[PDB]
């Protein structure tokens, strides 16, 4: 027998590479090229989604595309002024009392010589007391830029597509465990389009499971690892902010503007959000039905609210419409398992530092008008605690706060392999 | 690189002298910009130099009444003498030295030289004349002396 050379053999190895964007704004789709699938019969490929390299590259990409969008906007460095603030009581609701503060300060004008007396509205979570004289909360760590009004935070879908010489393997397993062997693997050019939403406790506008509710963890015995739940039937939610704000442009420099909240047209009420009752009960019943497989039969699985920490991790924080919400969600995780609607007391903050960074915030300008908003709840991020053994009772609390876990629920059926076309094999021929 | 001084020609006594040397067609990097003085009754002397970061070095005989400043924006440097006296009448040059060791360094890129005379007198007429030299025409004419009080005196004999 003599060795031969075959060029173009179908073998691959696992590797890491540079995945370029593709699309059908903050997320710069101008650079993305505009936008197929080949089934593979007799192959079984070992998958892993907690060691996946696509999620970290996607997270760094999302951070950098966020950072390049705030570059040409106004710095808002002169806004750090000694504010002078009082309450606002144009017929304020008793639950709303103390949240909104009228404020007035001295601001520089377009000319460098003169100055003007400007009034604005600020929430209680934005101003802090000087130790009535107040000041902004960002004047202590880092003064930060303002989000420009022309760009929008709407999550356009993007496709992550591999270059030449690589391939993306997609599982068609209908009951995929999240790791281990995959009986049916399909080779696609690239993904289905991922919406890069931002959330903390509940996943929004995600991809649904197609047959049953799947719960995936890196280690179900360990309590320090998060628990990702994927739904099969969506739960509808309503965003609501029932106020009519007026944006007035205050000019603080030669060609720079500071869009401040002017006044409220009418009554002020809380910016609640509504979820259905029976739909949530049926979905949570399916969830508590499945979790008894991993944890044991006749075990009392109950749900408590969030443990603590800062406001971002503890509260549900989404971005619908253009304002930043921070909702309570304590009427959602209360039950113990052996036409009503659950309303949630939500609150709005303006100075936002999103990607867990210090010294880099961003002022969100107010949006004129009333905001109506709906979305689907197609995923939860749970976290158990250190309960004692043989108690037959476990409490699950909504965790979150890490932005990798939102995009690990979409890139859970993908991997990147490096095709190598060279191989050797023996046969009967001999070179003449 | 060409240098040229500019400033007043007649300075009243016990005042502050000021001059400015402008650098044309060159840079301020790595060059000691000096100031030099040529008196007829005291020979050639040295005032001091300034490096482009502001490190100065003044003459020890004139230390305490000299100040040299650099300005890289307008591409020039300036000299200030305080409490001038009638013994400071000379011709002032601006020169340069290369960066390194001054054990063998020699002054180059000299200026044209502006005459500066420090006086203490007032306007008077000739008693047959400090601000204007008198013209005597009828013969032979002699150049005028400089007295210690600060006046002039010439003669003209056929």
């Amino acid at each position: 027998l003599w060795v031969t050379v075959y060029y173009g053999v179908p073998v691959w190895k696992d590797a890491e590479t540079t995945l370029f964007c593709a699309s059908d704004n903050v997320w710069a789709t101008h650079a993305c090229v505009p936008t197929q699938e080949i089934h593979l019969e007799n192959v079984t490929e070992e998958f892993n989604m907690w060691k996946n390299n696509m999620v970290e590259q996607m997270h760094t990409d999302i951070i950098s595309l966020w950072d390049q969008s705030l570059k040409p906007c106004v710095k808002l460095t002169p806004l750090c002024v000694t504010l002078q603030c009082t309450n606002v009581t144009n017929n304020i609701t008793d639950d709303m009392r103390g949240e909104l503060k009228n404020c007035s300060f001295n601001m520089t004008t377009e000319l460098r010589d003169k100055k003007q007396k400007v009034y604005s509205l600020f929430y209680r979570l934005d101003v802090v007391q000087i130790n009535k004289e107040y000041r902004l909360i960002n004047c202590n760590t880092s003064a930060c830029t303002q989000a420009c009004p022309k760009v929008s935070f709407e999550p356009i879908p993007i496709h992550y597509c591999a270059p030449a010489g690589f391939a993306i393997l997609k599982c068609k397993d209908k009951k995929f465990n999240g790791t281990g062997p995959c009986p049916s693997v399909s080779t696609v050019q690239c993904t289905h389009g991922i919406k890069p939403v931002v959330s903390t406790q509940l996943l929004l506008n995600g991809s649904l499971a197609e047959e049953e509710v799947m719960i995936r963890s890196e280690n179900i015995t360990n309590n320090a690892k998060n628990i990702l739940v994927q739904f099969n039937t969506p739960v509808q939610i309503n965003c609501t902010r029932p106020n009519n704000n007026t944006r007035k442009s205050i000019r603080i420099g030669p060609g720079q503007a500071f869009y401040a909240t002017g006044d409220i047209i009418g009554d002020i009420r809380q910016a609640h959000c509504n979820v259905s009752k029976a739909t949530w009960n049926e979905t949570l019943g399916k969830v508590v039905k499945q979790l008894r497989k991993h944890f044991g039969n006749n075990t009392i699985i109950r749900f408590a609210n969030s443990s603590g920490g800062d406001l971002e991790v503890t509260t549900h924080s989404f971005n619908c419409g253009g304002e930043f919400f921070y909702c309570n969600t304590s009427g959602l995780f209360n039950s113990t398992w052996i036409n009503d609607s659950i309303t949630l007391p939500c609150r709005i903050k303006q100075i936002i530092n999103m990607w867990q960074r210090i010294g880099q915030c961003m002022y969100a300008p107010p949006i004129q008008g009333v905001i109506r908003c709906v979305s689907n709840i197609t995923g939860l991020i749970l976290t158990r605690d250190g309960g004692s053994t043989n108690s037959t009772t476990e409490t699950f609390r909504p965790g979150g706060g890490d932005m990798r876990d939102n995009w690990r629920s979409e890139l859970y059926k993908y991997k990147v392999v490096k095709i190598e076309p060279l191989g050797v094999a023996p046969t009967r021929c001999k070179r003449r | 690189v060409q240098l040229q001084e500019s400033g007043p020609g007649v300075v009243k006594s016990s005042e502050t002298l000021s001059l400015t040397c402008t650098v044309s067609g060159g840079s301020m990097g790595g060059t000691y910009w000096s100031w030099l003085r040529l008196s007829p009754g005291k020979g050639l002397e040295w005032i001091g130099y300034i490096f482009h970061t502001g490190e100065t070095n003044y003459s020890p005989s004139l230390k305490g009444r000299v100040s040299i400043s650099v300005d890289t924006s307008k591409n020039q440097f300036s000299l200030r003498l305080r409490s001038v006296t009638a013994a400071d009448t000379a011709v002032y040059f601006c020169a340069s030295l290369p960066r390194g060791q001054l054990v063998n360094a020699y002054f180059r890129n000299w200026g044209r030289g502006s005459l500066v005379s420090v006086t203490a007198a007032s306007t008077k007429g000739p008693s047959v004349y400090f601000p204007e030299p008198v013209t005597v025409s009828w013969v032979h004419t002699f150049p005028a002396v400089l007295q210690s009080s600060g006046l002039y005196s010439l003669s003209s004999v056929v």
């Binding site: 060795v3 050379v5 179908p10 | -």
Partner: protein, 122 residues
């Protein structure tokens, strides 16, 4: 079939479809990810073509060489190889013992070239 449709098939069926894999190896500051990947693909394709060209093997897909098959690399018979095994398990088996084959072909081609050099001189 498609780009990798013969990956699950056996060797005797996947050796007839070597054209489809070989054809698809060469298909605002953050648009540099598009530029960085293309040079990498070009360099990898040029490395594969150069390594084919060292063995006197370029220009063809199925290519035969007169280096004998050492039994220490694979002691199994040829009868079960080409109809009861896919290419992935072959890559798994000869993930080891590959670098010395890549040098044996390298020396054997130069020996054959010098023997051709001697025969064409007389």
């Amino acid at each position: 079939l498609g780009f990798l449709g013969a990956a699950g098939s056996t060797m005797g069926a996947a050796s007839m479809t070597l054209t489809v894999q070989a054809r698809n190896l060469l298909s605002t500051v953050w648009g540099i990810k598009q530029l960085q990947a293309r040079v990498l693909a070009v360099e990898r394709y040029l490395r594969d073509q150069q390594l084919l060209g060292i063995w006197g093997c370029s220009g063809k897909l199925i290519c035969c060489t007169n280096v004998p098959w050492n039994s220490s690399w694979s002691n199994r018979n040829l009868s079960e190889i080409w109809d009861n095994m896919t290419w992935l398990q072959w890559d798994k088996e000869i993930s080891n013992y590959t670098q010395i084959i890549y040098g044996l072909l390298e020396e054997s081609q130069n020996q054959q070239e010098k023997n051709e050099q001697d025969l064409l001189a007389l």
